[PDB]
Symmetry: none
Subunit: 91 residues, 3 copies
């Protein structure tokens, strides 16, 4: 159950998501959507929901990434202009 969302990042500069480090029964330490804030690009799209696993955002893979690593990469990518593609596994 994989879903890829492509956000133009034109009406919003921020995704508007909080992430949390969690480990799953597949052995890795994954990144999951903690909560979705109002007024963000992710909330406007509506496909991603709390509890979904963040596998890839743009060209950066998040499958084996610590909670500390993921927060930096997301903030670094959000600071860049242009589109953001998120690949998630639905909860």
């Amino acid at each position: 159950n994989i879903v890829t969302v492509t956000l133009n990042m034109e009406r919003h500069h921020f995704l508007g998501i909080s992430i949390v480090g969690q480990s799953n029964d597949r052995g890795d330490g994954g990144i999951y959507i903690g909560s979705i804030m109002k007024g963000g690009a992710v909330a406007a799209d509506g496909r991603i929901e709390p509890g979904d696993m963040l596998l890839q955002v743009n060209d950066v893979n998040f499958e084996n990434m610590s909670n500390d690593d993921a927060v930096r990469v997301l903030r670094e990518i959000v600071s860049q202009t242009g589109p953001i593609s998120l690949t998630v596994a639905k909860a």
Copy 2:
């Protein structure tokens, strides 16, 4: 959406909550209520919900506090008898 909850802590000794640190893409993190166990003091009151952000417990501010610091402070405060006041953002 700020809510202050005062618990008597008489029929229960534990809040019955787990807390977790969460960071967003805007730069600001915080301590959040992970889950509320059934049969606990927080669950009995019912006003606090999973996902609420923990701002203050009694006289201690939690806004810029690490997950390790927050857990010790909660255990230190919970160990005391008497009421416990939690200030959350819904």
Copy 3:
């Protein structure tokens, strides 16, 4: 409120759950679609993981807990989970 759930592990090979270390323990972070736990429906996000098969999760660090869950899923047969509801 303790609940023990026994999964046959016939229609699915994976539980499809995330666990997280949270602290006043191991808790169910989220339940993935297409997993055995989601199909059963009794376990919910926020439940605390007390025991999975023969392994106790009450006093376990995040490092051991993910490894044990990974090893148990690799074994054939049913999986029984003991949780505290939220």
